[PDB]
Design a protein around this ligand. Structure first.
Ligand SMILES: *[C@@H]1O[C@H](CO)[C@@H](O)[C@H](O)[C@H]1NC(C)=O
Ligand SMILES: [Ca+2]
Ligand SMILES: [Ca+2]
Ligand SMILES: [Ca+2]
Length: 108
């Protein structure tokens, strides 16, 4: 069910974009602090892709709005859901939306 609470927005296709997660009845973004291919691989597999192609820092697919829900995401890279990775307290970040994280998943 966790796959319903993550999404990729404003990419060239559904395989890529700004990462947004659903928490407390709202979509919010993910800070790029410590954002790396281990975290991206977890996101990509959650969404049904084979894995991560590349991750991007500094709002590569534009700034989100609203809450920044996750910061300092520290996935090992093999988790079945990003919500079992280590990360910040929900909504507690030292980030702005200029730091919103993104991913391109291996698909094409
Ligand atoms: C979407 O991403 C592009 C870069 O590919 C960015 O320039 C643009 O701001 C983003 N779109 C939004 C919603 O602004
Ligand atoms: Ca940063
Ligand atoms: Ca941080
Ligand atoms: Ca990380």
């Amino acid at each position: 069910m966790d796959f319903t609470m993550i999404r990729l927005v404003n990419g060239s296709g559904p395989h890529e974009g700004r990462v947004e997660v659903y928490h407390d009845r709202r979509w919010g973004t993910v800070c790029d602090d410590g954002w790396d291919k281990k975290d991206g691989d977890v996101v990509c597999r959650m969404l049904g892709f084979r894995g991560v192609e590349e991750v991007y820092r500094t709002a590569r697919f534009g700034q989100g709005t609203g809450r920044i829900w996750m910061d300092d995401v520290a996935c090992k890279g093999t988790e079945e859901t990003i919500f079992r990775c280590s990360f910040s307290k929900w909504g507690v970040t030292n980030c702005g939306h200029a730091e919103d994280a993104s991913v391109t998943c291996n698909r094409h």
